[PDB]
Write a protein that binds this ligand. Sequence first.
Ligand SMILES: CC(C)OC(=O)[C@H](C)N[P@](=O)(OC[C@H]1O[C@@H](n2ccc(=O)[nH]c2=O)[C@](C)(F)[C@@H]1O)Oc1ccccc1
Ligand SMILES: CCCCc1oc2ccccc2c1C(=O)c1cc(I)c(OCCN(CC)CC)c(I)c1
Ligand SMILES: [Ca+2]
Lengths: 555, 672
Amino acid sequence: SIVEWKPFDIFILLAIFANCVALAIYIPFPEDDSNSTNHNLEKVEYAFLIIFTVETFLKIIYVRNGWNLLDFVIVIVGLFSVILEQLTDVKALRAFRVLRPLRLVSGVPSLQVVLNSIIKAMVPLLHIALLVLFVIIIYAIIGLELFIGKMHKTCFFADSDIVAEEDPAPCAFSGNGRQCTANGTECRSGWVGPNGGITNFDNFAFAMLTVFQCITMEGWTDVLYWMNDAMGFELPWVYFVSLVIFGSFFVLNLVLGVLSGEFSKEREKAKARGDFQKLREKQQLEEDLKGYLDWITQAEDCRAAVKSVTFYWLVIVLVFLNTLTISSEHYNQPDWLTQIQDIANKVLLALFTCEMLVKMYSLGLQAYFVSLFNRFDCFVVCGGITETILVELEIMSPLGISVFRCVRLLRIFKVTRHWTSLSNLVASLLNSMKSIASLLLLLFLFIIIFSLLGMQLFGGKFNFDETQTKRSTFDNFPQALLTVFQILTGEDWNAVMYDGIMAYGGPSSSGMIVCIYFIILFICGNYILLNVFLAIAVDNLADAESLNTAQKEEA
Amino acid sequence: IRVGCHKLINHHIFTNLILVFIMLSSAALAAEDPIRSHSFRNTILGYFDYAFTAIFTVEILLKMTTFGNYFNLLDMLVVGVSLVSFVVKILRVLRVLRPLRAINRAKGLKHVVQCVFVAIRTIGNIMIVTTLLQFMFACIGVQLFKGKFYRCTDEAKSNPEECRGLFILYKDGDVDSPVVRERIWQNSDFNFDNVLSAMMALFTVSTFEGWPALLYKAIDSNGENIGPIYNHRVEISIFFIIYIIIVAFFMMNIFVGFVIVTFQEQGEKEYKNCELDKNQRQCVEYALKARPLRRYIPKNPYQYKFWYVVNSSPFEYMMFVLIMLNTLCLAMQHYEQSKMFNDAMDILNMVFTGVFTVEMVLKVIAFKPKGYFSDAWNTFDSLIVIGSIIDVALSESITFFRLFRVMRLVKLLSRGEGIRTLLWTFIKSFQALPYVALLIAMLFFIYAVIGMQMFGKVAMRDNNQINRNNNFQTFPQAVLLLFRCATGEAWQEIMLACLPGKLCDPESDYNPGEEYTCGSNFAIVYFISFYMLCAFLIINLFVAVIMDNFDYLTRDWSILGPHHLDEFKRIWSEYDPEAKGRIKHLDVVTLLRRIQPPLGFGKLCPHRVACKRLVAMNMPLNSDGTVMFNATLFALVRTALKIKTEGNLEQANEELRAVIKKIWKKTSMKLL
Ligand SMILES: CC(C)OC(=O)[C@H](C)N[P@](=O)(OC[C@H]1O[C@@H](n2ccc(=O)[nH]c2=O)[C@](C)(F)[C@@H]1O)Oc1ccccc1
Ligand SMILES: CCCCc1oc2ccccc2c1C(=O)c1cc(I)c(OCCN(CC)CC)c(I)c1
Ligand SMILES: [Ca+2]
């Protein structure tokens, strides 16, 4: 319509962020419970729907672009969800609201290009994915043939349906495996399974799920031991050891090699542009300024001691003593050591601040604020001198003692100044901090989106055991975020998957279809991590390595 | 006369005999019973060591006769320990140094060990930084969770003054099944009491194992000496999140990145780019290392009819379809299937094995069976059907032959351009570096033997991590435990299970009265050192394998590659029924017409550009229909790369004899 470009596109982005916050505040109560916050948030969501529809109809002139396609798909599915909710799994139709945070990347081109690069860096991995698919299928069929329905025989009591031990394990199938020998115990069929029936090889879907669980090096030993108990003792080790080596060690080598060979392609292409020269030119004049700032000023504007060789080692000894005092606290420490620590802190703070005031009034006030190496030293000294008076005055702050010891602990970094190798990488890291922050923000957005989706799906649904409370749930936003992070690191993600499967019925029924949420989250989440933290390392280490070659030859 | 001893020690067979004796002695060491000290097997094995330690004794003296380095001192150290052994536990532990004696013998082992040491030295900067970061985080964690990880046996008493006496426990939450249990105010297994404990806990967190439990234990931490509360401070998880992001995601990926970049820079010592770059060095060589092939076209057209029938695109696509169908029919057998379902499966299996046998007989008739078995794929499927065809009458041991029919899907993996070559390249690279995995094998051997000697007497129970499936009582089982820890499954749990206060199995010859003695404080350093060493060695092996074939990983398919030359050779062989050197020039125009533009010529008229270019460039002045394989392929390669003018053609020969490897008299006709 009428020209409205600079205020409109940032106001709508602020609206997106506000909608993200509103979605984060919502608490998924179990069994249709609610409070006042959700009662207000439904009207807030209404208002967001009307504003989104208004701004969509304002700019229709638009559908061919994929981003705008998703933009109005979200609006139309939200409208349909509202209509169906008013005219009454209708509540699950609002799970498309989780894609609204994804609209924020369209508002920032600087992050849109990063997302596009990450997505485009995925095509070479399709061969490895296909190979993994064949490996999984082949091993699933092999498991189906070798052992089907054999982990279904635990040891109950005498003429009863109650299992003997609280951690049941299968008996032998035909007198070869484990034998349950207790006071009164005979073992027969009729058992449900090891993980409630979720981990077994008595179906193609079950076999594929078990093989995918084992190929990620998570809980493969549990399956191996269960098969050792159920079947014999000589075959199962050949199946699982080879599956881990070929399926995981070999494939992780496949992915890492392909990624390494892909980063080098773009490193040797942007090098022809002159990106390394920009960093080299900036760094080559930093050594030309330090000399042309002291020598040109040392003539007419204590400096003998600070530039000596004894002063540096004395400061090293002082910081070593500071570290020793810091790293000596423990539970039930002797009463004579607390006083030693609290007087050593005082005297060493006084000595460090005396040294700092000597340094400040020996070379120049305006020549040290520019350098970042000594810029936070004044903050550390001020915080240390503030802590003493804060504690001794009428402010106790029992937790404040443990928060002010960290800034005093950071003084250990004073030993890592003259390295010429640590600082060389730090220079490149500071140069590329903008790309670093962009990648980290994209990772954070991905985590937030998956946390919101998990809150929508499994929110208030892990209350099915009635005997214990789960810690890795999706009850609220911080807990969902922690759970998504844990699944991302790949630690006991199978337990969360089993809980999510049982939350929708069990191994039977159509509840197992939700397992693709954790399969996608692990595969897609781990790909991003290997394309973010590895890319930061690779493209900032070759830059530092090449600087040393230029710096050494020019020296 | 100390020259005969020199001849003996330097003899061709003596070094091999010494090496095989060393490996046999190591194998004997890895077969001793760790539990039963008074066992018959150990007595026999001890007799074996007596002869083995005498040969090693008679060769050091024999070598000492002819001489008058640090590796020789190590050899004397190992022999000395055995003689002194004849306390004793330390000598028994030091007996594991036998495999190290083979380092000085095999050159490859020495080279890989030196490379590993160099890699360790060049990466020491990062290790110091990450160790300092872990130390800082351990100090912060000590300040934050000092003594707050305590808890009582029952979650009803929240201070030590209340956690005394007995209490009623309701098993599994049932109110009608109570049992009396003691109240113990016990600390957590991994805590932040002092700096060492904090460092250990943070190491376990950084290994991405058991970290959620520590997270949810730290979230509940109330105070100095009182019990936890459910979700007391969720915001304390920021410490764990920040630590994980900074160390395990950043300082650990920077480790692998630094290894990769160091290997890549070290391998770039090929400073021979006086006239040719990396692309020329990668493309021209395949011209030299080429050997033509024939099509194996048969005779007797009555037999060639079947050959024409078989070798066709529709036949291959049909076999693809039926192999996928057989795979689908295999992978839909469920549990407790119906009798009719099983009967249908049996009939369908009979049909599929019959159609595959028909395939086999048709192909063996049509493809001249003398050379039919020459190919690897053709022999592979023959074994599949033969094992499958004998089970049809056995339906009414056998399980082994069933797995054969699954392998037909593997042949479908080599049906795509790129997934087959990726595998080919990486298995070739693995085969090219066999000594790198030998370091991992030696590490596993040494640590398994040490685990036997140290924790081999810990009793096996059912509720603990040292169970019937996981212990140090046998070499396969100890190696399996080490593999499980390398994967990092519950390695810290086993480490905790190996502490001194553990029950011993009632089979070792221990002093009566005391049975909670086996286990040692060596477990912590043992497991931590093994994890670090195995992770480093695995990273080193992975990066070495990746760097061995790095040209393929950066192929840049747009410019050129060996695939283009292979396609050229395969298309050419169609017009060359035999590889007898010289070929016919009649259909060269159509041959180049069949080639892709990057190597041949485009869709435009060949008479305007291609025909001019074929004759304009210098060619050997041979006969009308005589021209060698190299005389065409190398000429095409030189046409595609660094095109020059006339007069300086002998510069190509100069480059071949100077920069390229020895011509080996293969360029006599290529001089023209
Ligand atoms: C010890 C086990 C794990 O065996 C190994 O691979 C070696 C002994 N050490 P490692 O620490 O193993 C964990 C990393 O595997 C990455 N992974 C997996 C699948 C995937 O699809 N994507 C992906 O990134 C990760 C999930 F990111 C983890 O950080 O190997 C590293 C290799 C390169 C960079 C960092 C670590
Ligand atoms: C042979 C001596 C070098 C072994 C070694 O020492 C170190 C000191 C500080 C930091 C790392 C090392 C180190 C490693 O090689 C090493 C250690 C770890 I922990 C490590 O990461 C553990 C595996 N992984 C779990 C998924 C971490 C993310 C890796 I990769 C390499
Ligand atoms: Ca794990």
